[PDB]
Amino acid sequence: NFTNINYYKDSYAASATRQDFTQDPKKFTQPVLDSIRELSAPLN
Amino acid sequence: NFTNINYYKDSYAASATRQDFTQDPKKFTQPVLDSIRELSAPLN
Amino acid sequence: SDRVAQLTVGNSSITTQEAANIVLAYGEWPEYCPDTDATAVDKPTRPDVSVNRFYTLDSKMWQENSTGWYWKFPDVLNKTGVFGQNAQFHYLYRSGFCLHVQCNASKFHQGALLVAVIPEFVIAGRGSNTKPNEAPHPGFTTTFPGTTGATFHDPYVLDSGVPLSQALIYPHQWINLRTNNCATVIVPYINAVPFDSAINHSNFGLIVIPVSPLKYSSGATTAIPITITIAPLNSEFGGLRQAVSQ
Amino acid sequence: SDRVAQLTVGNSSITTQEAANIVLAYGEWPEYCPDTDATAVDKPTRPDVSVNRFYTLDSKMWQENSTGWYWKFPDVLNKTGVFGQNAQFHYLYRSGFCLHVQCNASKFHQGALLVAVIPEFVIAGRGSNTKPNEAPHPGFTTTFPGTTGATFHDPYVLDSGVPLSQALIYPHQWINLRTNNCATVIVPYINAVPFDSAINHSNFGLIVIPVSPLKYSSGATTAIPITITIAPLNSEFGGLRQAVSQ
Amino acid sequence: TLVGQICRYYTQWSGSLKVTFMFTGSFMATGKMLVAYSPPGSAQPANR
Amino acid sequence: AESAANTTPSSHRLETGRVPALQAAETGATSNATDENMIETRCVVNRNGVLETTINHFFSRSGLVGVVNLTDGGTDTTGYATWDIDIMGFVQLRRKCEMFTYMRFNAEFTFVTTTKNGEARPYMLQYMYVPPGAPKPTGRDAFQWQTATNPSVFVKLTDPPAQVSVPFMSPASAYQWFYDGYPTFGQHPETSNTTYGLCPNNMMGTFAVRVVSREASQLKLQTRVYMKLKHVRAWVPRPIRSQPYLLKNFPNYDSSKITNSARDRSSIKQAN
Amino acid sequence: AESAANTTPSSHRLETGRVPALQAAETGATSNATDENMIETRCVVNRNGVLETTINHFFSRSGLVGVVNLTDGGTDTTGYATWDIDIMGFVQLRRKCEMFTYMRFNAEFTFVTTTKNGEARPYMLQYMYVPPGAPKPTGRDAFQWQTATNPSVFVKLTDPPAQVSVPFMSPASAYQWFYDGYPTFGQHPETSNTTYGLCPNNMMGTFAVRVVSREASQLKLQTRVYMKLKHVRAWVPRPIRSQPYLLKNFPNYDSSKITNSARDRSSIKQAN
Amino acid sequence: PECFTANGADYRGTQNWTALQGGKPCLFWNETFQHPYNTLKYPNGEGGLGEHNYCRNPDGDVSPWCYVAEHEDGVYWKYCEIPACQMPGNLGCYKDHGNPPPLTGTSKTSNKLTIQTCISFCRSQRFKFAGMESGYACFCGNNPDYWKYGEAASTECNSVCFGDHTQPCGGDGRIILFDTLVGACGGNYSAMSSVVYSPDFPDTYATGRVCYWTIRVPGASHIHFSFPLFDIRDSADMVELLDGYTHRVLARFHGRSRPPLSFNVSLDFVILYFFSDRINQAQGFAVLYQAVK
Ligand SMILES: CCCCCCCCCCCCC/C=C/[C@H](O)[C@H](N)CO
Ligand SMILES: CCCCCCCCCCCCC/C=C/[C@H](O)[C@H](N)CO
Ligand SMILES: *[C@@H]1O[C@H](CO)[C@@H](O)[C@H](O)[C@H]1NC(C)=O
Ligand SMILES: *[C@@H]1O[C@H](CO)[C@@H](O)[C@H](O)[C@H]1NC(C)=O
Ligand SMILES: *[C@@H]1O[C@H](CO)[C@@H](O)[C@H](O)[C@H]1NC(C)=O
């Protein structure tokens, strides 16, 4: 099982590299400045 | 990524070897004996 | 201590009584261009007191049969003040924006507004013709409305073929007349190029669409204006030359 | 290594072959306004790349019966480029200036020019009437000539009642056609107030007066132009508002 | 020029260029010239 | 994270002050109320994978991109067959790619060529990529087909389909499918703004193809372009289009005859 | 250096003595005035690559070199088809190679053979390289086609194109495309100096090809030679020719009917 | 001559095919209820719409076009290549390959490039033939060898211009030819039978145009006139025909006057005069004349 081997001098001619599991969801779900707590009223 | 491997006894039958980044431009741009400074008059 | 806020940029201030939390678009603050991402060689100018301030546009009367209004933001401040003058003389431009939309009413009015920003908000022509010479295309006053603004014809499709329902992925805020009377969005510079001309390219555009219609009983006030204030945060200009209008 | 010089301000450069030493007016360099001497509270803007550059005016043909020309320097760059646009939008202004006057000829021409600056160069009316309603006063095109310039009527008295002979106390330079072909003066900000409007107040003004007349033999060139280049060093602007022309 | 043909062999270029003028008149002839570069935008400038 | 999310054991609450189900939607944020702050849940160790939902596994599909006809007649012949490289010709990959504003990727173009009636006769073809700025070949025996300082592929019809890899070659830092501006300065008209939305940062040259022979070959070929995206990065997610496409470089839709995003029901007080 | 050049932050100067913009051109040197000794620049970290502009990446292109016809008739037959190995037959690679005075490289000759109407029938060909001094084959059934102590390649038409590697075999230390002299001694005429510029250090033998069969084969083949330069070194750069070529071994041009290096304009005081 | 406009807007022909050699038949203009151009929508002409299948131009396109039958392969409309549809002054379209151009002369590029701006650019430098391609080009020249690259079809060179959107400015790699005498302001005409256009004929005529067209024939008996195209929406600008022997006016036609299509006059020194105004401009004239010896 080895698909990280390239056959040319150029790097864009390879296959899919190591997968990245990064998942930042808070930049779309809570784009607010005051961090709203989980157990609180959002407005006071 | 390995293209430095030759398959014959002769050396001219290989591919492009390691690239040389040498760039001497002063043998065409300033072919003069008295080294002209950057902040000076070229003739006095 | 959360419903009150005073935003101060330059020599202007915005006080509030009924406010939600401020929205920071994509979690990124608008800053200056770093040397790693920049590509121009000439040094850019930064007034930082003369163009970074709250500019107030006109007010639009929110009626009952209203569809909605929209704007091209690097093109609305293209002629108003030191910012517009400084943008006409320069070729390059890069800044963020701070927004504030005012809409107040009594405790006997009902309604809701959806104010959001759309990067690269492209206006689509309206028609069913596929021939190249008669295919409808929007005019210049429709693509770039200027400081006045433009109205929607089919606000259900955002005048672009994309449904209004799915437009909640954008940096948005609601104006519910029973909860708040203002909405605030801070958006950074969003583009695939470091600098760009602020005359023939609008980065994003505000849109205000009343989802719930304005309703009231006979006897209350009938003039409900829609006021918008914009602060061009962290402005940069490059390529000084003759001033061009459009 | 003294007769050659290359001045670089912004994206402009001035090379020279026949030059004298550069003149620094009153031994003071033009710098920014310190906090001790300043009086305004708002933060001033400093482009430093878009207004600080060499602006070249028109050329004037030096004839044999020429008297001389003069200029109001905070009023010549009042409409040309990013500097003029930035000065129309602002109320306050403070900068120094770098000058360069080009006048070349052959080794068979003779003549001399006196280029100098006069702080608060007030134009005087010409007449012998003392009644208040008929006393002659100079027009607006005479007091502020604009980017074009104005000519002298009595250059022996500098058009102000002060003799040209005693005008050597000012920061001056000579253009002798057998010695050099250019003159360079660097003048700082000279005023009794920290900031000032660059529209209704000129701080100083250049004057060029041929003391020795232009002479040549029949057969040489006859068109001798007078070219001037100005660099607004260390510019500051304050009080951003609507743009006014004059 | 040679730089023009080399840029003609390729399709995309970057970096700054240099234009060098040279006066080949008489020794007694003098004068001043203004060489001005203008960034993109409008057409050729009309006046100085 | 290789799994989705585990669930914490919960219980009931009888107390005042804590309101996790009153998340305000006027603030523009998404409700962060979990199941543990609600109806009593249990302890579940979830091991469902999230690898397939990534962007590199979502854009790793070829799809049809272009269809190029080559008649090569005897009396009404042209010889060559150019094809402007654009992705907006077929609405499947266009709908899959126009859900983002800025993208950056590589390509794995593949060319499947068949005959009119369908037959693999051993005819050698020449696939030429003309970059933007290079002259286009005019004729099956032109000067441009020498392919000096120009990449080209020689393959037959009986051979497997050709497949090359294409790097990121836009002069900007990323591609864009929505350009809110104009390509050049000047006065823009009010009648027909046919240049609005045009982005010069997407013109990837022209693709040409001919038949390598001497006299002629009375055969009508039909090439298909399959482009596999790889090493893709996307920015600024955009909603998916709900209207049918009408043009290639313009997102025009029908003013009348509008298509609703959801089909109609019998009544609102009815689930079926 | 893997990048081009970085820019130092600059500022304004107000002082006498330093003149960086007065570089004299009478000395024969190039002006070394940078941007930092001029208009105020900024700090830019340039990471644009210079790898593509090297000589080995500039001469790594095949291009067309030779076209050899082989009729192989029945009544006006010849059988063989020789081709003098020279690069001056097609002006593209000639224009790309005559911008230097002395070069030294290797070759990657490739042979693409097609029929008159265009068809790959399984006919085996024999490509023979005849070094300078060896006898040339005269006939499709000659004695020289034995290829004893002589390299040759056997390949069919249905096979992929053949490709061999060729070393540097000039008796001098490098090639030359411009020879300012005469090949031999003696009195040289004034009427027609047809031997001027001839360099015996470039005659790389002759290339022959036939059809391996017994009786005949009524087919007109047409071979194409594609030579890829590799391991190339160039000396003494020469300007690029601006006149159209007229002959192969002579840089003759038209005395009248001269081609200007730049096209004409409306006026000198006009940029467009 | 059948077309006196640069886009064939007025072409009342009998062409019911798209091309004469290698063409498909056109559909009738009354059996086209699917498309927004039919006789159920436009009665009493409106570009020419009856019970025929002729190649008309009702939408203000760059060329006349008909409805072809859709063969489930996209195109449902094709341009008609009419051989007898060319304004006098249009030489045709030709191919453009490379550095040796068909027109060896000055070149000019602009974002507002119509037919008359390029004609005026080539005319203000005394060139004989104009030329444009791909919408942004203006190739001048005086060489007679402009067919060095071959003749292209008329439907191939229908790329729209950038300044105007009703004119064909050549095409990608295909240059369209025009002589510089069209749309000029006066000229010594000595041909047997030619056409005289108004100033700025492909555009609308400018404000304040006044010129003198002179026609001399070395020995003609009497001259014949015609008025193919005439469109004036005002009564201040007007055309005149004068004789220069004793300097008297023959006939004065304006917007409120319908000129006769043909008449003879026993003169040989006719001069044309056109006094324009600065209020209303719609279109010019295409006066064709004929001298019988
Ligand atoms: C040797 C033949 C190769 C054939 C493929 C051509 C190579 C160049 C392909 C560039 C890849 C561009 C992918 C899409 C680019 C732009 O977004 C589209 N033109 C606009 O939709
Ligand atoms: C087995 C068949 C091989 C066919 C190729 C022949 C091998 C010898 C090739 C020598 C390479 C020479 C390249 C050019 C040499 C001289 O510069 C030219 N003749 C003059 O332009
Ligand atoms: C075209 O019109 C002519 C009229 O003479 C008629 O004979 C012919 O059949 C028509 N062709 C088609 C295809 O309608
Ligand atoms: C259209 O007109 C033609 C000619 O008069 C006629 O034959 C045909 O039936 C008409 N079609 C319809 C739908 O009326
Ligand atoms: C004018 O004379 C010609 C004779 O050459 C005749 O053909 C023409 O019809 C005449 N015109 C009128 C209006 O009668």
mmCIF file with all atom_site columns, C-alpha atoms in Angstrom, chain D residues 7-129:
data_model
loop_
_atom_site.group_PDB
_atom_site.id
_atom_site.type_symbol
_atom_site.label_atom_id
_atom_site.label_alt_id
_atom_site.label_comp_id
_atom_site.label_asym_id
_atom_site.label_entity_id
_atom_site.label_seq_id
_atom_site.pdbx_PDB_ins_code
_atom_site.Cartn_x
_atom_site.Cartn_y
_atom_site.Cartn_z
_atom_site.occupancy
_atom_site.B_iso_or_equiv
_atom_site.pdbx_formal_charge
_atom_site.auth_seq_id
_atom_site.auth_comp_id
_atom_site.auth_asym_id
_atom_site.auth_atom_id
_atom_site.pdbx_PDB_model_num
ATOM 1   C CA . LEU D 1 7   ? 17.240  63.272  -6.495  1.00 0.00 ? 7   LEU D CA 1
ATOM 2   C CA . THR D 1 8   ? 14.692  60.492  -5.935  1.00 0.00 ? 8   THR D CA 1
ATOM 3   C CA . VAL D 1 9   ? 11.293  61.199  -4.355  1.00 0.00 ? 9   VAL D CA 1
ATOM 4   C CA . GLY D 1 10  ? 8.591   58.570  -4.814  1.00 0.00 ? 10  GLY D CA 1
ATOM 5   C CA . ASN D 1 11  ? 8.583   57.174  -8.357  1.00 0.00 ? 11  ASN D CA 1
ATOM 6   C CA . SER D 1 12  ? 10.393  60.121  -9.966  1.00 0.00 ? 12  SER D CA 1
ATOM 7   C CA . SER D 1 13  ? 14.093  60.911  -10.451 1.00 0.00 ? 13  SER D CA 1
ATOM 8   C CA . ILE D 1 14  ? 16.026  63.976  -11.605 1.00 0.00 ? 14  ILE D CA 1
ATOM 9   C CA . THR D 1 15  ? 19.503  63.443  -13.045 1.00 0.00 ? 15  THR D CA 1
ATOM 10  C CA . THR D 1 16  ? 21.920  66.294  -13.645 1.00 0.00 ? 16  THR D CA 1
ATOM 11  C CA . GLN D 1 17  ? 25.239  67.005  -15.354 1.00 0.00 ? 17  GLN D CA 1
ATOM 12  C CA . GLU D 1 18  ? 25.850  70.720  -14.659 1.00 0.00 ? 18  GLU D CA 1
ATOM 13  C CA . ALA D 1 19  ? 24.834  71.397  -11.060 1.00 0.00 ? 19  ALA D CA 1
ATOM 14  C CA . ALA D 1 20  ? 25.890  73.524  -8.120  1.00 0.00 ? 20  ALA D CA 1
ATOM 15  C CA . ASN D 1 21  ? 25.366  72.486  -4.505  1.00 0.00 ? 21  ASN D CA 1
ATOM 16  C CA . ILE D 1 22  ? 21.821  71.939  -3.265  1.00 0.00 ? 22  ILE D CA 1
ATOM 17  C CA . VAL D 1 23  ? 20.341  74.729  -1.139  1.00 0.00 ? 23  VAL D CA 1
ATOM 18  C CA . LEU D 1 24  ? 18.675  73.971  2.205   1.00 0.00 ? 24  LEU D CA 1
ATOM 19  C CA . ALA D 1 25  ? 16.507  76.932  3.175   1.00 0.00 ? 25  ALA D CA 1
ATOM 20  C CA . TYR D 1 26  ? 17.379  78.433  6.581   1.00 0.00 ? 26  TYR D CA 1
ATOM 21  C CA . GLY D 1 27  ? 19.342  75.298  7.490   1.00 0.00 ? 27  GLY D CA 1
ATOM 22  C CA . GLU D 1 28  ? 16.172  73.468  8.566   1.00 0.00 ? 28  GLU D CA 1
ATOM 23  C CA . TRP D 1 29  ? 14.914  70.225  7.064   1.00 0.00 ? 29  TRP D CA 1
ATOM 24  C CA . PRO D 1 30  ? 11.177  69.796  6.379   1.00 0.00 ? 30  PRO D CA 1
ATOM 25  C CA . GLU D 1 31  ? 9.783   67.375  8.954   1.00 0.00 ? 31  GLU D CA 1
ATOM 26  C CA . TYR D 1 32  ? 6.442   66.377  10.458  1.00 0.00 ? 32  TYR D CA 1
ATOM 27  C CA . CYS D 1 33  ? 4.599   68.487  13.006  1.00 0.00 ? 33  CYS D CA 1
ATOM 28  C CA . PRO D 1 34  ? 5.520   67.568  16.604  1.00 0.00 ? 34  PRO D CA 1
ATOM 29  C CA . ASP D 1 35  ? 2.938   67.081  19.326  1.00 0.00 ? 35  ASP D CA 1
ATOM 30  C CA . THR D 1 36  ? 4.217   70.103  21.265  1.00 0.00 ? 36  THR D CA 1
ATOM 31  C CA . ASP D 1 37  ? 3.582   72.624  18.469  1.00 0.00 ? 37  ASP D CA 1
ATOM 32  C CA . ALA D 1 38  ? 0.438   70.987  17.062  1.00 0.00 ? 38  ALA D CA 1
ATOM 33  C CA . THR D 1 39  ? -3.043  72.173  18.026  1.00 0.00 ? 39  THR D CA 1
ATOM 34  C CA . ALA D 1 40  ? -5.583  69.990  16.194  1.00 0.00 ? 40  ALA D CA 1
ATOM 35  C CA . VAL D 1 41  ? -7.022  66.892  17.855  1.00 0.00 ? 41  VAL D CA 1
ATOM 36  C CA . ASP D 1 42  ? -7.897  64.766  14.816  1.00 0.00 ? 42  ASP D CA 1
ATOM 37  C CA . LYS D 1 43  ? -5.227  62.479  13.386  1.00 0.00 ? 43  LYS D CA 1
ATOM 38  C CA . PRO D 1 44  ? -3.688  63.738  10.118  1.00 0.00 ? 44  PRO D CA 1
ATOM 39  C CA . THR D 1 45  ? -3.162  61.540  7.076   1.00 0.00 ? 45  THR D CA 1
ATOM 40  C CA . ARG D 1 46  ? 0.224   60.907  5.447   1.00 0.00 ? 46  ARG D CA 1
ATOM 41  C CA . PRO D 1 47  ? 0.230   59.210  2.016   1.00 0.00 ? 47  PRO D CA 1
ATOM 42  C CA . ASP D 1 48  ? 4.015   59.612  1.676   1.00 0.00 ? 48  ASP D CA 1
ATOM 43  C CA . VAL D 1 49  ? 4.078   57.945  -1.751  1.00 0.00 ? 49  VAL D CA 1
ATOM 44  C CA . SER D 1 50  ? 1.148   59.464  -3.642  1.00 0.00 ? 50  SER D CA 1
ATOM 45  C CA . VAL D 1 51  ? 1.644   63.180  -2.958  1.00 0.00 ? 51  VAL D CA 1
ATOM 46  C CA . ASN D 1 52  ? 5.424   63.180  -2.295  1.00 0.00 ? 52  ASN D CA 1
ATOM 47  C CA . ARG D 1 53  ? 6.794   63.110  -5.841  1.00 0.00 ? 53  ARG D CA 1
ATOM 48  C CA . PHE D 1 54  ? 8.128   65.419  -8.543  1.00 0.00 ? 54  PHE D CA 1
ATOM 49  C CA . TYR D 1 55  ? 5.352   67.255  -10.392 1.00 0.00 ? 55  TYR D CA 1
ATOM 50  C CA . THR D 1 56  ? 6.478   68.983  -13.592 1.00 0.00 ? 56  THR D CA 1
ATOM 51  C CA . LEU D 1 57  ? 4.762   72.202  -14.654 1.00 0.00 ? 57  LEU D CA 1
ATOM 52  C CA . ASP D 1 58  ? 4.726   73.741  -18.131 1.00 0.00 ? 58  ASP D CA 1
ATOM 53  C CA . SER D 1 59  ? 7.706   75.322  -19.884 1.00 0.00 ? 59  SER D CA 1
ATOM 54  C CA . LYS D 1 60  ? 8.033   79.028  -20.677 1.00 0.00 ? 60  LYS D CA 1
ATOM 55  C CA . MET D 1 61  ? 10.138  80.266  -23.632 1.00 0.00 ? 61  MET D CA 1
ATOM 56  C CA . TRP D 1 62  ? 12.893  82.605  -22.296 1.00 0.00 ? 62  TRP D CA 1
ATOM 57  C CA . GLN D 1 63  ? 12.905  85.470  -24.900 1.00 0.00 ? 63  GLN D CA 1
ATOM 58  C CA . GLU D 1 64  ? 15.237  88.505  -25.038 1.00 0.00 ? 64  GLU D CA 1
ATOM 59  C CA . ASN D 1 65  ? 12.702  91.096  -23.812 1.00 0.00 ? 65  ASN D CA 1
ATOM 60  C CA . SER D 1 66  ? 11.570  88.887  -20.929 1.00 0.00 ? 66  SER D CA 1
ATOM 61  C CA . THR D 1 67  ? 10.868  90.383  -17.503 1.00 0.00 ? 67  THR D CA 1
ATOM 62  C CA . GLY D 1 68  ? 10.273  87.325  -15.331 1.00 0.00 ? 68  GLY D CA 1
ATOM 63  C CA . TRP D 1 69  ? 7.703   84.914  -13.970 1.00 0.00 ? 69  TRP D CA 1
ATOM 64  C CA . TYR D 1 70  ? 6.459   83.940  -10.472 1.00 0.00 ? 70  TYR D CA 1
ATOM 65  C CA . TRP D 1 71  ? 4.196   81.293  -8.738  1.00 0.00 ? 71  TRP D CA 1
ATOM 66  C CA . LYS D 1 72  ? 2.144   80.694  -5.478  1.00 0.00 ? 72  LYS D CA 1
ATOM 67  C CA . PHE D 1 73  ? 3.289   77.187  -4.564  1.00 0.00 ? 73  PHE D CA 1
ATOM 68  C CA . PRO D 1 74  ? 0.487   75.882  -2.299  1.00 0.00 ? 74  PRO D CA 1
ATOM 69  C CA . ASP D 1 75  ? -1.829  77.058  -5.098  1.00 0.00 ? 75  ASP D CA 1
ATOM 70  C CA . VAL D 1 76  ? -0.084  75.638  -8.174  1.00 0.00 ? 76  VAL D CA 1
ATOM 71  C CA . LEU D 1 77  ? -0.523  71.972  -7.093  1.00 0.00 ? 77  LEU D CA 1
ATOM 72  C CA . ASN D 1 78  ? -4.065  72.752  -5.933  1.00 0.00 ? 78  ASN D CA 1
ATOM 73  C CA . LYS D 1 79  ? -5.608  70.878  -8.917  1.00 0.00 ? 79  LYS D CA 1
ATOM 74  C CA . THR D 1 80  ? -2.948  68.512  -10.323 1.00 0.00 ? 80  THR D CA 1
ATOM 75  C CA . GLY D 1 81  ? -3.122  64.901  -9.216  1.00 0.00 ? 81  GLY D CA 1
ATOM 76  C CA . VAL D 1 82  ? -3.523  63.096  -5.928  1.00 0.00 ? 82  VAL D CA 1
ATOM 77  C CA . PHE D 1 83  ? -1.950  66.031  -4.077  1.00 0.00 ? 83  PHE D CA 1
ATOM 78  C CA . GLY D 1 84  ? -4.519  68.489  -5.401  1.00 0.00 ? 84  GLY D CA 1
ATOM 79  C CA . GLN D 1 85  ? -7.404  66.094  -4.813  1.00 0.00 ? 85  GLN D CA 1
ATOM 80  C CA . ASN D 1 86  ? -6.217  65.386  -1.258  1.00 0.00 ? 86  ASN D CA 1
ATOM 81  C CA . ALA D 1 87  ? -5.834  69.129  -0.617  1.00 0.00 ? 87  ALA D CA 1
ATOM 82  C CA . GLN D 1 88  ? -9.332  69.985  -1.863  1.00 0.00 ? 88  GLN D CA 1
ATOM 83  C CA . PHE D 1 89  ? -10.986 67.536  0.559   1.00 0.00 ? 89  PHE D CA 1
ATOM 84  C CA . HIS D 1 90  ? -9.041  68.720  3.627   1.00 0.00 ? 90  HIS D CA 1
ATOM 85  C CA . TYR D 1 91  ? -9.095  71.943  5.650   1.00 0.00 ? 91  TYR D CA 1
ATOM 86  C CA . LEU D 1 92  ? -5.599  71.834  7.181   1.00 0.00 ? 92  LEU D CA 1
ATOM 87  C CA . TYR D 1 93  ? -2.267  71.462  5.398   1.00 0.00 ? 93  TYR D CA 1
ATOM 88  C CA . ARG D 1 94  ? 1.437   71.463  6.274   1.00 0.00 ? 94  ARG D CA 1
ATOM 89  C CA . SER D 1 95  ? 4.339   70.425  4.049   1.00 0.00 ? 95  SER D CA 1
ATOM 90  C CA . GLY D 1 96  ? 7.748   71.397  2.759   1.00 0.00 ? 96  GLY D CA 1
ATOM 91  C CA . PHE D 1 97  ? 8.812   71.595  -0.865  1.00 0.00 ? 97  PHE D CA 1
ATOM 92  C CA . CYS D 1 98  ? 11.738  70.533  -3.039  1.00 0.00 ? 98  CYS D CA 1
ATOM 93  C CA . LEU D 1 99  ? 12.364  72.598  -6.167  1.00 0.00 ? 99  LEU D CA 1
ATOM 94  C CA . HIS D 1 100 ? 14.309  72.171  -9.394  1.00 0.00 ? 100 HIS D CA 1
ATOM 95  C CA . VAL D 1 101 ? 14.418  74.671  -12.271 1.00 0.00 ? 101 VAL D CA 1
ATOM 96  C CA . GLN D 1 102 ? 15.751  73.429  -15.613 1.00 0.00 ? 102 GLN D CA 1
ATOM 97  C CA . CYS D 1 103 ? 17.264  75.831  -18.147 1.00 0.00 ? 103 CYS D CA 1
ATOM 98  C CA . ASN D 1 104 ? 19.888  74.476  -20.550 1.00 0.00 ? 104 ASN D CA 1
ATOM 99  C CA . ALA D 1 105 ? 21.732  76.200  -23.382 1.00 0.00 ? 105 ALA D CA 1
ATOM 100 C CA . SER D 1 106 ? 24.880  75.797  -25.451 1.00 0.00 ? 106 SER D CA 1
ATOM 101 C CA . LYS D 1 107 ? 28.390  77.033  -24.667 1.00 0.00 ? 107 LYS D CA 1
ATOM 102 C CA . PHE D 1 108 ? 27.779  79.984  -27.013 1.00 0.00 ? 108 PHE D CA 1
ATOM 103 C CA . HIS D 1 109 ? 24.812  81.480  -25.120 1.00 0.00 ? 109 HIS D CA 1
ATOM 104 C CA . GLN D 1 110 ? 25.155  83.912  -22.224 1.00 0.00 ? 110 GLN D CA 1
ATOM 105 C CA . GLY D 1 111 ? 22.797  84.972  -19.467 1.00 0.00 ? 111 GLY D CA 1
ATOM 106 C CA . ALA D 1 112 ? 21.940  84.566  -15.818 1.00 0.00 ? 112 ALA D CA 1
ATOM 107 C CA . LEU D 1 113 ? 18.763  83.856  -13.854 1.00 0.00 ? 113 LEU D CA 1
ATOM 108 C CA . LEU D 1 114 ? 17.880  84.590  -10.234 1.00 0.00 ? 114 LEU D CA 1
ATOM 109 C CA . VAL D 1 115 ? 15.547  81.946  -8.797  1.00 0.00 ? 115 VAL D CA 1
ATOM 110 C CA . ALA D 1 116 ? 14.538  82.424  -5.167  1.00 0.00 ? 116 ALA D CA 1
ATOM 111 C CA . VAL D 1 117 ? 11.641  81.922  -2.767  1.00 0.00 ? 117 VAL D CA 1
ATOM 112 C CA . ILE D 1 118 ? 9.850   84.656  -0.828  1.00 0.00 ? 118 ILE D CA 1
ATOM 113 C CA . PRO D 1 119 ? 7.681   83.705  2.174   1.00 0.00 ? 119 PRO D CA 1
ATOM 114 C CA . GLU D 1 120 ? 4.395   85.638  2.056   1.00 0.00 ? 120 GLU D CA 1
ATOM 115 C CA . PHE D 1 121 ? 5.083   87.119  -1.392  1.00 0.00 ? 121 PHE D CA 1
ATOM 116 C CA . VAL D 1 122 ? 2.317   89.728  -1.498  1.00 0.00 ? 122 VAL D CA 1
ATOM 117 C CA . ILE D 1 123 ? 1.460   91.203  -4.899  1.00 0.00 ? 123 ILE D CA 1
ATOM 118 C CA . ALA D 1 124 ? 1.048   94.986  -4.826  1.00 0.00 ? 124 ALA D CA 1
ATOM 119 C CA . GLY D 1 125 ? -1.294  97.019  -6.985  1.00 0.00 ? 125 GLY D CA 1
ATOM 120 C CA . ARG D 1 126 ? 0.208   99.451  -9.477  1.00 0.00 ? 126 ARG D CA 1
ATOM 121 C CA . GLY D 1 127 ? -1.126  102.997 -9.491  1.00 0.00 ? 127 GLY D CA 1
ATOM 122 C CA . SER D 1 128 ? -0.933  106.469 -8.010  1.00 0.00 ? 128 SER D CA 1
ATOM 123 C CA . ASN D 1 129 ? -4.478  106.703 -6.639  1.00 0.00 ? 129 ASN D CA 1
#
